[PDB]
Amino acid sequence: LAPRQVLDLEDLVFTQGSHFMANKRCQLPDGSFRRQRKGYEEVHVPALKPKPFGSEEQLLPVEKLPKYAQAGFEGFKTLNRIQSKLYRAALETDENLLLCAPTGAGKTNVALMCMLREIGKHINMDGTINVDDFKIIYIAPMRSLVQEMVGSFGKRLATYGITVAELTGKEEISATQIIVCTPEKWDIITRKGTYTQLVRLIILDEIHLLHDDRGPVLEALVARAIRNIEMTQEDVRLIGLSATLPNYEDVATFLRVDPAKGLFYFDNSFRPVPLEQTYVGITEKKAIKRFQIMNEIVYEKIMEHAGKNQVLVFVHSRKETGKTARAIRDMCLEKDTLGLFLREGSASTEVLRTEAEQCKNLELKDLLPYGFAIHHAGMTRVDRTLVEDLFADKHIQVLVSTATLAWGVNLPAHTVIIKGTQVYSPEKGRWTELGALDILQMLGRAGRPQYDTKGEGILITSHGELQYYLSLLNQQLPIESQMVSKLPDMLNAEIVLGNVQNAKDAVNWLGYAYLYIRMLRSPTLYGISHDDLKGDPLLDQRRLDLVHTAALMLDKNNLVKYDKKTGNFQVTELGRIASHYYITNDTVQTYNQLLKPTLSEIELFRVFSLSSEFKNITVREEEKLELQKLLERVPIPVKESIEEPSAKINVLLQAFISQLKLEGFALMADMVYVTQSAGRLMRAIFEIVLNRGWAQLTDKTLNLCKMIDKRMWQSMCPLRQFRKLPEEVVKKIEKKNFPFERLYDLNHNEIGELIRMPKMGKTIHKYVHLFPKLELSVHLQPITRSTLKVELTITPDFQWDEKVHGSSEAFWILVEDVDSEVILHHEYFLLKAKYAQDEHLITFFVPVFEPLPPQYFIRVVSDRWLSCETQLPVSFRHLILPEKYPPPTELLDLQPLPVSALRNSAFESLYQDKFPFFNPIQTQVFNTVYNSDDNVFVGAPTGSGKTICAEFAILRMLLQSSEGRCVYITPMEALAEQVYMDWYEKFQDRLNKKVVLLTGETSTDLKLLGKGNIIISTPEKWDILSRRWKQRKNVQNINLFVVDEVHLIGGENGPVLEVICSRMRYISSQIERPIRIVALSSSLSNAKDVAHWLGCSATSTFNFHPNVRPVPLELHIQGFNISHTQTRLLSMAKPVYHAITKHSPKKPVIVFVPSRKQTRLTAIDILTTCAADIQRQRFLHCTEKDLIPYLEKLSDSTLKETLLNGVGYLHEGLSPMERRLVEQLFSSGAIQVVVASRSLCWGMNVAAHLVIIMDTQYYNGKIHAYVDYPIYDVLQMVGHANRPLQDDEGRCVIMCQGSKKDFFKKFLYEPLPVESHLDHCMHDHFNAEIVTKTIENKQDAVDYLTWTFLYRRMTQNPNYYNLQGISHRHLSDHLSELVEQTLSDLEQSKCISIEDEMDVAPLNLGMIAAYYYINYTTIELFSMSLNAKTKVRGLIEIISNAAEYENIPIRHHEDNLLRQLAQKVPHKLNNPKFNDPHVKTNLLLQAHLSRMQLSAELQSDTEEILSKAIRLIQACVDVLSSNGWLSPALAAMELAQMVTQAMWSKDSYLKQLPHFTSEHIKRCTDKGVESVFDIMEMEDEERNALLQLTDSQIADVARFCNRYPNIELSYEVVDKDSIRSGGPVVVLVQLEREEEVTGPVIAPLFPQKREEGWWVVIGDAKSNSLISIKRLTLQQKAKVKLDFVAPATGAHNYTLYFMSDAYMGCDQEYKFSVDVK
Amino acid sequence: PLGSMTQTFSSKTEWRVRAISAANLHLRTNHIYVSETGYTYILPKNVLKKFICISDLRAQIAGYLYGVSPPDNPQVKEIRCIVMVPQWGTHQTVHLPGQLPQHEYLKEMEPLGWIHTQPNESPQLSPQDVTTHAKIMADNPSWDGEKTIIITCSFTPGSCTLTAYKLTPSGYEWGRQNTDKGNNPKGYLPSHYERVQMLLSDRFLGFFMVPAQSSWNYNFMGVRHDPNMKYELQLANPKEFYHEVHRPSHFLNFALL
Ligand SMILES: Nc1ncnc2c1ncn2[C@@H]1O[C@H](COP(=O)(O)OP(=O)(O)O)[C@@H](O)[C@H]1O
Ligand SMILES: Nc1ncnc2c1ncn2[C@@H]1O[C@H](COP(=O)(O)OP(=O)(O)O)[C@@H](O)[C@H]1O
């Protein structure tokens, strides 16, 4: 619990790493012998004989495998011994496996068999593989082995259509299904935390790396995944491949491998090629004579196989290959023994000479004719392939190479010699023994699986290391844990991920590491007594002491804040950067100590040189002469002396940037290690200083990052970065003293006289414009005198070449202050190749003060290109700041108004039981709203009771006109549904009036406002009916118009709210009887503007500020320094619980979280902290047993468990019923805390005492970026912290990022300024006003604008709308330009007609778009895609391409779903591209007509699509018929009834009736029924038998029969004789129903209710000609009159069509002949 | 011969010590101090601290002064901008081009003289600055003798002391004629100048103007600096004295071993 002891971790570290020998003895196989010789001793081990086939194990043929796995094994006839023993456990079970076999036994195919099983789990009906369904991770030790396995696995599985790739230094990871990486690579990826949730299989190849220093990486990977399986219950299969070493059973426990199922051990006797071992241990310790003894032994061993077998020699440096190959040969001809390798006259000799000529390599040229060769990574790619080809063809006799050949190529040899086992370790700063993995892999290449009946491995080393390599290659080197060394770095990585939040989590996490298993089985080897082992049998105290020690080290270095007593861990931004950038904790401590904004480039290099990754580097005495030569000439001065190793590291870095080659062998290896680490190290320093706002140091470190990558300083010409260039010219361009900027505006050949090469003329001009260059323009938009909104326009001014720029180019947008000292704002900008020519718009906020600073600076710097920057100065000399907002309306100290002040018994019955008196705000406005008819403005904070203020005006209207009609407008649909429920009981249940809610379906919307007394609607819903006000009387007869939450005018959907209220004012001006307008708003800074715009007198303008809220609001704003969103959310988890126990320990709490997934995670986190506090069920105020009546109604299992502890959560994915149960339990006080998602803040019918806003950002899956909360959403969330008759105060804690803290303080403590954006969407409204003839000329458009809010704000804040003055000529030109631009686009799309550049008139297209409320862009694309030959398939395609469907989300976890849905969908589409919402919309449409049950989100996505489909369908009907196209119009008319009933034209008409199953309609398609009228005319006891339904399903079938359309049609041609060409032909059509209707259209699968619409079409069938068409709605009786002009003289036959828009099977057809003289 | 005992010379160029010392110039910005006439000059602290951090402790650097007067009050001169032009200097003087700064931003301001660092604090104004200030007045009539001043930022130990001087009529006609560059020229008198009042302030901010295509420091590229050179200006802040782009020879001479 708390008996901690601080441990010395370094004394628990096995210092030798993989060279640590745990076995004290080593037994040799029978026949092993030793021979003493001069200066050295040899040890021989005979080749082991295979084990005779034990039991029933026969070699399994490949054709006996499962059918689907035989393609990954084509080219193999039979599996070997270990593969046939493993194929059943590999292919037929999901058991975690561990295979231990000697190198070369064929372990890869076993891992391939499990990969094939996982791929088989995603077989498709199509036959391909669902590739976005899973992911496989193949962990390989070496990078060369990774690359070869990518090609091998890519070829073996190419027939499966599967991507196998190695991760680059990230759309590829989603594209690849099998990721091949090193342990360190996958550690860095999962450390960030993406697509790792799809990992189903992990393969840890060469898992005996655990014994190596890199071993702890494998332990961290396994413990992370296994522990993740428990908190996710998504199982992952673990496959481990190992060599033959002890402790394999401990490895099996470490991988969760059942020993009786998944453990398989094969000793070295299962090596397919027998191996004779030879170990040469040299006793000579003097380096010079030991060097020659080594060269004498290799010669003696070479001669034993010279001419008989090929010999492969392994050295440990790219330089030693040539030395060893030459030294061997040179002594051969010194002894005259060259004729043995080559026959001096056979085919082997000549081909070694012809290719030595064309080989190009110089060193290999001197060795290839003699039979010798070299191989190392420093050589070319085709030379190494030739060395591999010539050696595989048995031409090369002696090949000297390094370990890279052993890992990356499958090149076996009969004899393998390991000349020496000493390697230089720059990380350790000394010579060390070779790694165990390299030894096994090199000697594993001894013996070819075909020619050689045996292999001969020879290993030369020092005598003191014979026992080690004898143990390693004879199954006797135990695999131990090197984990205590890297323990502090790994614990921090789990804290940053949130997997470990306290010490007990770490003790549990430590129990999953290989160190824990080895500590239990061998405690004496890990510094543990065998009696301390069971004074703590599970090692609880020992692990807790190890965690305590590591946590203290992290706390001292400021990576973690560690509470020693409670054990809790706190993440920090410093601790996150060390984890994400793979930096040790001691280094980031040094960075935290020395980094300062005033840092020079001199100290910056010194800071880098002190990183703990170079702690072992020393200055050797043989290096000081070469180092001092450079130190006295380095361009960056070095303060430290030569004796200090930090100066050596400093000089080596500067020498690497200048590309200088030194001579010291240790210096070169030290320089590579220092600069290889410089990449992520300097990148870590960059992120530290960038997020702190240090402008000067950020520019220094970002340049140093690029100078290390590009290997050049800033002083050089930036054209060096183009590697494809004959270099010796750019060095002359540098000599030419002229800036690189002068080359842009310059001739393609004036370059040549400047650099002396018209020779290489336009070659320079090519790369000058290939260099990235961006142009910047800015538009300043002042919000206050304290805040500015900057709209930055980025315009690329270069050209894209994928060979140079790749797929994207990254840039850093930096906004610096006056002194280039503080970064006021910064963000990441990625320029994709698909948008390399389009302008980019970036918007952000910056603070300003009122001795207005001279200027700011905007710098757009490239992320990788050196000297690639564009700085735009932002002068404020002409910036026009808006005026200070006027003081608020003072809250009068009036007496509280009683409910009896209404003086109406019926009205008082609405509030008598709710509260005794109105609040002070309702008190002030009472006389003006209840006892007056003037226009009134009420601006008060959210929660001030403004809803009752509007009810005052409604109650007054009912007194005057008892059947008056009021229209209430609220911006959110969730607000309208809530207001409708309250006002239905108040005004309809009690006062017996009519309260309706507009549905958005116009087919039954005009019918409610004429019926109701209070109309509740959203802006857009009212806009469509508002446009036809001059003909429809039910819009201008309105007595009272109320618009609520009018401060949303500055929001995304603000302009629509501006248009209707501006229209109601214009209507009221031309209506004789003025319309009262009541405006409710949040506290507005410019409320007098809203008052003047809506005609509110100043005495009736109530502009209150947030301080006058009835329930006082206690606001707290916490800043959080972490910039990584997921890490910042973690740092706020426990503060959420601590804010609950502080501000509301027992009163209800609401927590707003960004996403749906966070609702569940936070609710569990709050309970876990409540659990560790032993406060379990403290938020549960209801008895456990008194909740199951409500509890077992849910589907979510997690929601049930947390509700049992008083914590609920709400999100958009819950059931509409489940939310009401959680909302009722919260308001009941049963549960105290509920965690709501961000998107539910507008439809939440519960209030609480404390509101916690967890972060103010959300990820948008469309732009792939985090978006700030709209300020309107935050105000709505704070409004939930208000309970007037429960609490004396309201409290809200907002936990935001530190940079956003100043923004909320300025826009929450003060009233909110609101602007308009109607000028950014004028086309659709201008077109509407031209259709109804409100705008007839260009002067009318300017006059029309004078009634808006956009318009009035142009004089108060002109710079916000891009005006430079408020002069009445300044804005007169600004309006005219907006008028000219808007009318020119409408005339371009053929919706309006402009005559003499003055008069405007609507066209047929414009009248259609304004009628059905459709974007003018959609109506133009509609008009250019339909023919006379348009069918149902194309109608679905054209309407799917509508602009109203552009914003349908694209969740790429649905890619294969839509890919397969495309095959299940009846109509096939050409060019299938699934990155388009219009293609997804088309697929969701056909999925609805097919009645296909989809996802919960896909079905919801379809619902929003269908809410606009009817109006789009009706638009094409008006377009097709206007062009005389008969067949497509009728087809579109029956597409409307198809969408309504969710059917197809060929489907059965009985599919409309309820409960009619999928097949029992076919039960009677064989009989004689096929219409609904057939079912209508069938008798009960006769028809209630075939239906197979119950006493309630019969009635649903029945009630559809009564409302099914059954109209008797009658037509008559007036004067059927007195007709000829040019004469009027009129046809009267009479329609009458049988009975009538009680209710709208019965269409359960359509979201909105509809009314029965009908067309009457006259057309010529054989000519596809539509003559006349008229829409209508029928009420019992109706009479329509169709007219047209007769054609030529003759006897033409027409057709009368009577088609519905909501029912299938009611259409009627009547042919008739008209004799035209 | 040769000697029983001999060593090899190691290069120790002097700019490396000055570059290391230039890194600590920001510490002096925490300790700046000031030492009648009729005109009061107000220097904003933001541009002065920046002018210190971009300087050298021995090589003098200079910048041109521009500003205006407060609205309804003309007895005070508010310095609003410092302009850095291509220049190279020594421990006693600086060398500017003959052309004065020309830009639209400065057309609404008046020239108020110049400001320059100097190594040692001296109780009297340099004879070189009298010659420089007077010769600028002879070639540019926009520099009023009763309006333009010389601000000296002398590097005191661990601090910075500011003193502002104007030129008397007596000193102008001697500075324009003087061709003796020594410390005791012939006809140098303390009556050639008087001290003007100078006050630092934090209530407003100034800005910098730097060359358009070039930078300002030519102390390592003196060959390319000519008194007849021309230059345009941009609205940006100047780089440090030893910035990378000010001494290219040091970085590429190391590249060619
Ligand atoms: N079933 C098999 N049948 C015939 N040859 C095989 C078979 N399996 C492997 N070989 C070969 O044996 C060699 C061993 O390769 P590998 O799978 O990497 O062994 P390991 O991983 O255990 O060291 C490969 O070249 C491989 O092509
Ligand atoms: N006069 C009042 N007296 C006591 N409680 C009230 C009063 N008015 C409202 N409450 C309650 O306070 C809450 C305020 O909600 P609301 O009317 O929507 O205010 P607003 O629209 O300004 O945000 C309502 O639940 C309401 O029932």
Ligand SMILES: [Mg+2]
């Ligand atoms: Mg292998």
Ligand SMILES: [Mg+2]
């Ligand atoms: Mg409200």
